[PDB]
Amino acid sequence: MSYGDYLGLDQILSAQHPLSPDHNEMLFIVQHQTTELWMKLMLHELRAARDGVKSDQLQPAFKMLARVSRIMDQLVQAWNVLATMTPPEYSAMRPYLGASSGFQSYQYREIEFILGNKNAAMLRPHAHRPEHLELVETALHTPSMYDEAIRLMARRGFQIDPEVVERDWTQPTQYNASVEAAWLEVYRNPSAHWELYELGEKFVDLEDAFRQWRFRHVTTVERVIGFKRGTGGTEGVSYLRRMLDVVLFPELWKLRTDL
Amino acid sequence: DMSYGDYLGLDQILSAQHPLSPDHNEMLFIVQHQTTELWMKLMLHELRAARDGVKSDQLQPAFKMLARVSRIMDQLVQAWNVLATMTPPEYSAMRPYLGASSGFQSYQYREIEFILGNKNAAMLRPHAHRPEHLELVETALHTPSMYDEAIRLMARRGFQIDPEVVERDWTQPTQYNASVEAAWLEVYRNPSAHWELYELGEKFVDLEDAFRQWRFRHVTTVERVIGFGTEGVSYLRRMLDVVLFPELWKLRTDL
Amino acid sequence: RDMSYGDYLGLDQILSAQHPLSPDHNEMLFIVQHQTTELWMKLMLHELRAARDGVKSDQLQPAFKMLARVSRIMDQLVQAWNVLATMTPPEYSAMRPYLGASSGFQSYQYREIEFILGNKNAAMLRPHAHRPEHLELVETALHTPSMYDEAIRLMARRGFQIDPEVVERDWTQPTQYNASVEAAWLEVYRNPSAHWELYELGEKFVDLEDAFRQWRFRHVTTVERVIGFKRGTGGTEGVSYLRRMLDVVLFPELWKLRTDL
Amino acid sequence: WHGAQMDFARDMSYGDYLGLDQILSAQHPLSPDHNEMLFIVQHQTTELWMKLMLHELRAARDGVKSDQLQPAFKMLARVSRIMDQLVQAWNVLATMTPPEYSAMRPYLGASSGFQSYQYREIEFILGNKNAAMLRPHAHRPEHLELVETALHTPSMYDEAIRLMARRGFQIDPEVVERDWTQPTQYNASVEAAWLEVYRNPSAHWELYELGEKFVDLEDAFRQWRFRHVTTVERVIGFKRGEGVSYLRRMLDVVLFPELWKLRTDL
Ligand code: HEM
Numbered sequence A: 001m002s003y004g005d006y007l008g009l010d011q012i013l014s015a016q017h018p019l020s021p022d023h024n025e026m027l028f029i030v031q032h033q034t035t036e037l038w039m040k041l042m043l044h045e046l047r048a049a050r051d052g053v054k055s056d057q058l059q060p061a062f063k064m065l066a067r068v069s070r071i072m073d074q075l076v077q078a079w080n081v082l083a084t085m086t087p088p089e090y091s092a093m094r095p096y097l098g099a100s101s102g103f104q105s106y107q108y109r110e111i112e113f114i115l116g117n118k119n120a121a122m123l124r125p126h127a128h129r130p131e132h133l134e135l136v137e138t139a140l141h142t143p144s145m146y147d148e149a150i151r152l153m154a155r156r157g158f159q160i161d162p163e164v165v166e167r168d169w170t171q172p173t174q175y176n177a178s179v180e181a182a183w184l185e186v187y188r189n190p191s192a193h194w195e196l197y198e199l200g201e202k203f204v205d206l207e208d209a210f211r212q213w214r215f216r217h218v219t220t221v222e223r224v225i226g227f228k229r230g231t232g233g234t235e236g237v238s239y240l241r242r243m244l245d246v247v248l249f250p251e252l253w254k255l256r257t258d259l
Numbered sequence B: 001d002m003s004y005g006d007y008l009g010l011d012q013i014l015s016a017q018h019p020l021s022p023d024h025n026e027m028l029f030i031v032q033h034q035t036t037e038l039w040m041k042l043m044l045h046e047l048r049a050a051r052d053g054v055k056s057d058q059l060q061p062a063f064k065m066l067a068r069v070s071r072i073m074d075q076l077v078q079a080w081n082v083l084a085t086m087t088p089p090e091y092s093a094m095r096p097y098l099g100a101s102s103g104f105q106s107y108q109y110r111e112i113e114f115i116l117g118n119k120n121a122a123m124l125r126p127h128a129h130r131p132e133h134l135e136l137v138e139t140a141l142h143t144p145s146m147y148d149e150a151i152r153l154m155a156r157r158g159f160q161i162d163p164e165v166v167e168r169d170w171t172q173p174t175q176y177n178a179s180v181e182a183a184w185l186e187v188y189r190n191p192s193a194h195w196e197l198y199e200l201g202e203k204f205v206d207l208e209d210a211f212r213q214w215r216f217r218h219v220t221t222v223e224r225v226i227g228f229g230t231e232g233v234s235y236l237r238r239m240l241d242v243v244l245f246p247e248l249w250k251l252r253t254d255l
Numbered sequence C: 001r002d003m004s005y006g007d008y009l010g011l012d013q014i015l016s017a018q019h020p021l022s023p024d025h026n027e028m029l030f031i032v033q034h035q036t037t038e039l040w041m042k043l044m045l046h047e048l049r050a051a052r053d054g055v056k057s058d059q060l061q062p063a064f065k066m067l068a069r070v071s072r073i074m075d076q077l078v079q080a081w082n083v084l085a086t087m088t089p090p091e092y093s094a095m096r097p098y099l100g101a102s103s104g105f106q107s108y109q110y111r112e113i114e115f116i117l118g119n120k121n122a123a124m125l126r127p128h129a130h131r132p133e134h135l136e137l138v139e140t141a142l143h144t145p146s147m148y149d150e151a152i153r154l155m156a157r158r159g160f161q162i163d164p165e166v167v168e169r170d171w172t173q174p175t176q177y178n179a180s181v182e183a184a185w186l187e188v189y190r191n192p193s194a195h196w197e198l199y200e201l202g203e204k205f206v207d208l209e210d211a212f213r214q215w216r217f218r219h220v221t222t223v224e225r226v227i228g229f230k231r232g233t234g235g236t237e238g239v240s241y242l243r244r245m246l247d248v249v250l251f252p253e254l255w256k257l258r259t260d261l
Numbered sequence D: 001w002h003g004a005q006m007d008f009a010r011d012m013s014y015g016d017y018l019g020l021d022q023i024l025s026a027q028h029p030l031s032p033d034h035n036e037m038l039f040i041v042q043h044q045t046t047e048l049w050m051k052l053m054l055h056e057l058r059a060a061r062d063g064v065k066s067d068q069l070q071p072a073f074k075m076l077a078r079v080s081r082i083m084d085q086l087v088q089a090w091n092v093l094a095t096m097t098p099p100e101y102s103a104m105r106p107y108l109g110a111s112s113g114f115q116s117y118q119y120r121e122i123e124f125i126l127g128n129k130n131a132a133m134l135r136p137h138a139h140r141p142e143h144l145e146l147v148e149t150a151l152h153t154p155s156m157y158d159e160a161i162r163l164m165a166r167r168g169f170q171i172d173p174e175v176v177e178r179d180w181t182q183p184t185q186y187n188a189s190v191e192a193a194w195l196e197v198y199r200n201p202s203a204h205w206e207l208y209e210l211g212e213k214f215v216d217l218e219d220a221f222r223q224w225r226f227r228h229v230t231t232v233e234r235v236i237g238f239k240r241g242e243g244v245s246y247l248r249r250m251l252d253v254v255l256f257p258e259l260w261k262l263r264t265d266l
């Protein structure tokens, strides 16, 4: 094998096709593609970590999660590159781009799903692509990594309501008081439940990082296209601002008030 | 209409990952290289336009592109943190399946080396079996580097530059030249009279520095995975002594 | 000069300024995290004041270099939160009883920073009334045209028709949107080659605001992960107060112009 | 303004609590140059972080020696975050150009970083013991005390070797107990033990994670050493002839040698 052959560089390096004649489009493309590639790896690591939670093998899953942390670090910092795109540069390419939409990233949606941000409406963008629909549908129906953590807590003897241990996995993650009581006992007695303590903090980290990514995205988008006002709640910067209110692991955050 | 994945070629880029081993960690090894190569693509794109801005004496937009190149280098130097999470056993399990493919074979990396003036004709060899890469690398070899172009722009601004450095065999390593340093010194000693050149000088130093860091992270991560003169970590260690823009660094002591 | 390392850097003071009040191991982090940030803020003020003087005596190229320095500083300040993020709620709970009413609300350097960036607020002088020396720095800072005010004035000196009422005004009032100022910026961004320094300058400002939003957002996220929606030692609503200050725009016309482009 | 306490005539404020009169009045430029503030602040912030780093390393080492590894891992995680700040910091000082430095140089005198006792305590805790490095601190008996206690105390790595021995690994006794003033050097029995650990990570997860935390620590420290020489070289250049050549030599420091060797023998 050559380097290029083993790495698939014939494909990786022939997928940059600028629609406009503008110098700054290569940036626009490469920034998305690098992100998509890292997401592929994040998905691979998260799914393995979830399998470790499932099988009570937390130590290797912690390692996987740490790797996800360092991947997320790349992704948040990446915005530093796109931030060198200016409004005039983007408006030069704009007319050539068409309706495309990060909304159509099926990898990003599977990440949200794996993190418990379930939404069956988010299947629609993928309906024309039965292979993508399948991936996102199956993830919608699979218990989230947080669902698995709650299940693990109950398999460690914490009295969690059965309706959050087994439920319709296609529904959004909603605060449950028995789950906060369990995390409270963990954080009040860390040396008695060190692994759950550590687990809790790795979830908070993952949420923290993802929040940062959400914020850096909407900030960068705004600095390139603005806050297009009065254009719907469904898309644009208005939508991306609402995405800042997403809570992934609710009782891990609430517990801080109640400690 | 054109979809997100149609525009971004996700069909290609997202099915180009082909692990040879059963090891869970091979995906990392692959995606690390791929994301880096992608970024190198954009870096090339940006450096070539910056070089054109130097040769046309339009430095303002060139500076903006170089600033962008720096942000990409920041990404590339930090990436190493992700690979750092591969432990030797992990890479040990993949290794039997890799075959003696090497980073020597990255033509994009070699073009970056060349545009930066680190010219070396022996380096075309790994690319002989692929006419498209061989062309790109050969052309780059014969093309004056961004440094060469900066030197020539100092000549056109009226600095006395040795004729033999304005026009030269361009397949030749970049080499210390005393008149070039004297021009750079005049620039640094009087920054307000030569602001653009002062700023450009510093962009070069930044770039070389950021490249040194990448050099160092690479060899250190390689060592922490497979452990410690022809080829190997020893080769990577010698790479640390590469000097790209000799007289900008020399000028520090003579200032 | 045969004065030593420590003597030159004042390490006797720097390195005996740590005074943990609780028995908790994690309090040194709480202290050093603030201290390092405050030190970097001093440097930042130092650079922003100079960069502002550059703007106002029309020496933009040095001021650009200085703002690039502020930007490298902001980058440290924003990544710094990764350190504090290693603090857990029980760790913080253990030192909280010993802390009293001290809170970053009473940072005077932070206020100077907001002021120089045009987020003027007279109410913000009171937490400093007990130290007449800080009072005076902050009060003078309130009264001084911001770096953004100086950019607007610069634009007027370059021939852009800016309303006199924003070329000269009561400087203690916070920044408010002005249509003539957006028109000025729009012309610059539509004709970048014809106005490159202004174009570069506008982007410096946006970078600055961007970095500052990041810092504010990392702050409030870190605070929530440590104390949730508990009220702040400073007496404020805590996280909800901090989320509100995320809402403030420093340089309105530079953001608004992106939609009108 | 939002229920915030305004009045601090009686109460302990932020500045009281943090000793900010101490911190914020310790900057005394000697040249009239704009850029000296940077030179000073850069060092001071690194010294501050270095203090916290000692605080956490000492506590981490305590957990190593009481076989309480979990808390130690968390401390070591924090030290890694601190080290990231310290490696990235060089981005700021990189903005200083030779002419800016040259202007303040005449005013500095013989202030060596050799004279940072905190930095020497970190080298020492990490096993880079060198008695000749107490010299710079002889004029300051409390600094000298700190540094020489450190020289005499077993390094964090020594304590890990020691813990492996308490955990049943055959370690040469002449490495479990040792002249702690002596530089750390390669012991085959120690590599043997790490090799057992890495070939069987699931049997020895805690040591496996510990080993990698040492390697992380050393790697980040290497990065700091590289960014240091590089930033120094771009400000004052490389005199061939202490010096930039001293700093180049430092790149050859190895702290945890059998953890690096074991990659080749795995
Ligand atoms: C200047 C460049 C960019 C612009 C103008 C932009 C704009 C937008 C907008 C307006 C949305 C809201 C949905 C919509 O209205 O279609 C969105 C969503 C999204 N974008 Fe970006 N974006 C940019 C860069 C990127 C990059 C580099 C990525 C990397 C993959 C990305 C990934 C996503 C994802 C994954 C979503 C869905 C988020 C959610 O549903 O919460 N975008 N983008």
Ligand code: HEM
Pocket: B032, B033, B036, B037, B083, B091, B102, B103, B104, B106, B109, B218, B221, B222, B225, B226, B231, B232, B233, B235, B236, B239
């Ligand atoms: C643990 C994983 C890695 C190992 C073990 C490794 C090993 C090596 C070694 C030993 C060399 C020296 C030449 C040779 O003998 O083949 C080399 C060169 C090179 N590697 Fe890596 N490497 C790794 C990761 C990476 C990554 C992620 C990249 C990113 C693209 C990369 C890019 C390169 C390049 C561009 C060269 C040529 C450098 C030059 O000529 O100065 N390597 N690699």
Ligand code: HEM
Pocket: C030, C033, C034, C037, C038, C084, C087, C102, C103, C104, C105, C106, C107, C110, C219, C222, C223, C226, C227, C231, C232, C233, C234, C235, C236, C237, C238, C239, C241, C242, C245
């Ligand atoms: C995990 C530790 C921290 C906690 C729990 C925390 C909490 C808070 C809270 C609740 C406030 C609101 C005012 C109040 O009610 O007191 C505040 C304000 C503030 N804090 Fe923090 N903080 C932390 C770390 C830091 C650090 C490291 C800095 C660096 C200097 C900092 C700087 C500030 C500033 C400047 C304000 C006033 C901001 C404004 O009024 O817009 N904080 N902090």
Ligand code: HEM
Pocket: D042, D043, D044, D046, D047, D093, D111, D112, D113, D114, D116, D119, D228, D231, D232, D235, D236, D242, D243, D244, D246, D247, D250
């Ligand atoms: C442009 C600024 C700097 C210059 C020119 C510089 C130069 C040097 C040089 C030449 C040495 C070798 C010993 C000697 O000959 O005195 C040294 C050592 C040292 N410096 Fe730097 N330095 C700079 C910035 C810094 C900063 C910001 C720090 C942060 C604290 C630092 C920390 C140290 C330490 C701890 C040593 C001893 C290293 C060892 O023994 O391995 N230096 N410095």
